[PDB]
Design a protein around this nucleic acid. Structure first.
Lengths: 51, 50, 221, 45
RNA sequence: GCAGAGGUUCUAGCUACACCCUCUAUAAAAAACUAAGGACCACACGA
């Protein structure tokens, strides 16, 4: 019951080094939004960077 | 000109589905578009999803 | 950064508790709370009933004498009972009741591991003097909601829609912590509501394990 | 000649006839699905 | 495989939209298989 469909990278379109488009095909129902929002907030509001 | 007639009664339990016509008492009618998972529902401060 | 910990678990009621995570900074609070709530509401391993067999009821829509309500309402009441198992992934519950009186879940002939967390949950009311109902309840673990129409034998077997979801209402609040000396630290309190089949601490821990393993798709340990 | 209601239907499998009783009528309480057979009627040839 | 019949199954199976092999007057070594019908008037309802 704890088994889950872990995603596997299928095709990462590498736009010029200032841009990228990463995608995952399998994942789980409702988990796509969870992971997307988690990553978006986690790297958009708190990241070690210099400016 | 008939020998015997057999009537078979089938009970279908039709659950709510995308496309089922749902409508209130005030003339607001609409087809259910998507059965959105509860985790995606807008929830108030109490956490109860609409 | 800071690491949230199980600082407190306020078991306010028998069903729902109030878990507390203390160390979190800007964003983390809301992000982690929303992720945990979505993981909990989406996929939590429950142990809801999925299959019922009555002693002398042919199908889901018939009715046996001596019972207050229809067999369909009996099945829907059975879906509502909260039951948790420890060892076996699959267990069969036998319910034997006789005489006038409501048939609560307390009279289920439970095994060593399986136990009912809400014995007061009424299933049906027996009315006739010589009225006896004998049902074999099949309870198995599972994740999410799977209806009986989208699964996979005898005519006497009755299928009840599976409702494997211990949690019913997950609410989180992000408020400032009370650390010894620091600012911009928030504590996440989750007002998770369960039917009683899951411990809030282990529920939170399992949801976090699911979230962490889902992040390992492109990140090594 | 007339047609009978028995369970003797040609060019069908035993799985379909399993639901039907010995006389070719579906057992009460059986959970049939789309395209299933309920009562066996065969026309004379 | 285009005009017919036979075959191991299951009455009958020759492309009938249709499934295997044989030949032009003769019937069997052989497993997956089978059916080609069906209007109008009224009512109520939806957009």
């Amino acid at each position: 019951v704890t088994e889950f469909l872990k995603p596997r990278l299928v095709d990462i379109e590498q736009v010029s080094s200032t841009h990228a488009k990463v995608t995952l095909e399998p994942l789980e129902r409702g988990f796509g939004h969870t992971l997307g929002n988690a990553l978006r907030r986690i790297l958009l509001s708190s990241m070690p960077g210099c400016a | 000109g008939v020998l015997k007639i057999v009537k078979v009664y089938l009970a279908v339990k039709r659950r709510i589905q995308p496309g089922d016509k749902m409508a209130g008492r005030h003339g607001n009618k609409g087809v259910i578009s998507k059965i959105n998972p509860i985790e995606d529902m807008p929830y108030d401060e109490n956490g109860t999803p609409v | 950064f800071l690491k949230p910990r199980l600082v407190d678990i306020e078991q306010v009621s028998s069903t729902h508790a109030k878990v507390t995570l203390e160390p979190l900074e800007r964003g983390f609070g809301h992000t982690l709370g929303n992720a945990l709530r979505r993981i909990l509401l989406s996929s939590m391993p429950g142990c809801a009933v999925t299959e019922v067999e009555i002693d002398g009821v042919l199908h889901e829509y018939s009715t046996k004498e001596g019972v207050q309500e229809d067999i369909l309402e009996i099945l829907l009441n059975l879906k509502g009972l909260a039951v948790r198992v420890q060892g076996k992934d699959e267990v069969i519950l036998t319910l034997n009741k006789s005489g006038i009186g409501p048939v609560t879940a307390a009279d289920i002939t439970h095994d060593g591991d399986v136990e009912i967390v809400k014995p007061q949950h009424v299933i049906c009311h027996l009315t006739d003097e010589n009225a006896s109902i004998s049902m074999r309840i099949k309870v198995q673990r599972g994740r999410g909601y799977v209806p009986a129409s989208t699964r996979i034998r005898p005519i006497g077997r009755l299928l009840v829609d599976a409702c494997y979801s211990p949690v019913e209402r997950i609410a989180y609040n992000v408020e400032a912590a009370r650390v010894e000396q620091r600012t911009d630290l928030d504590k996440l309190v989750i007002e998770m509501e369960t039917n009683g089949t899951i411990d809030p601490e282990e529920a939170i821990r399992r949801a976090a394990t699911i979230l962490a393993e889902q992040l390992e798709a492109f990140v090594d340990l | 000649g007339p047609e009978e209601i028995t369970a003797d239907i040609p060019n069908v499998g035993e799985a379909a006839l399993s639901k039907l009783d010995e006389s070719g009528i579906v057992y009460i309480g059986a959970e049939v699905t789309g395209g299933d057979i309920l009562v066996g009627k065969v026309t004379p040839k």
